[PDB]
């Protein structure tokens, strides 16, 4: 949406420090752990019967990092999120049929991972900025549902 110019800089300075190799994977892994029914959409992935198994599962790491890739493109296109995720939307909505409440969950789990990596640097105003971003992405992925 419209972050303020202040919010825009702060998300575009925190993001430049993200471990683009772990965060994605940590977010997805946490999604499958904290909300176990999401496990149903990853049948082809492997062993997910313990938290430990999930996080070290190479498929989770790899796809999770594709996910971060998608959030990255999002942050670069705050203006029309709706079109940037148009294909991902049809994918998750019409081919995948993932209930949209689950997009919100991933978004919030992603924020949790951010808090977890950045500690005190993930201030309340930085979070507020990131919540607008994740809401925006969620509403874009659910766009082909309306």
């Amino acid at each position: 949406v419209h972050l303020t110019p202040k919010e825009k800089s702060a998300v575009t300075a925190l993001w430049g420090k993200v471990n683009v190799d772990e965060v994605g994977g940590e977010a997805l892994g946490r999604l499958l752990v904290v909300y176990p029914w999401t496990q149903r959409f990853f049948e082809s992935f492997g062993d997910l019967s313990t938290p430990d198994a999930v996080m070290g599962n190479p498929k989770v790491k790899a796809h999770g990092k594709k996910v971060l890739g998608a959030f990255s493109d999002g942050l670069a296109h705050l203006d029309n999120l709706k079109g940037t995720f148009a294909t991902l939307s049809e994918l998750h909505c019409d081919k995948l049929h993932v209930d949209p409440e689950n997009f919100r969950l991933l978004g919030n789990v992603l924020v949790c991972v951010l808090a977890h990596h950045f500690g005190k640097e993930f201030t309340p105003p930085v979070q507020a900025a990131y919540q607008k971003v994740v809401a925006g992405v969620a509403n874009a992925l659910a766009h082909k549902y309306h």
């Binding site: 946490r30 752990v33 904290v34 938290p51 924020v111 949790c112 808090a115 977890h116 005190k120 979070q127």
Partner: peptide, 16 residues
């Protein structure tokens, strides 16, 4: 988020 930020050692996936 707050607990994640301050008690990262405790904030494991299972505990989360």
């Amino acid at each position: 988020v707050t607990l994640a930020a301050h008690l990262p050692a405790e904030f494991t996936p299972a505990v989360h």
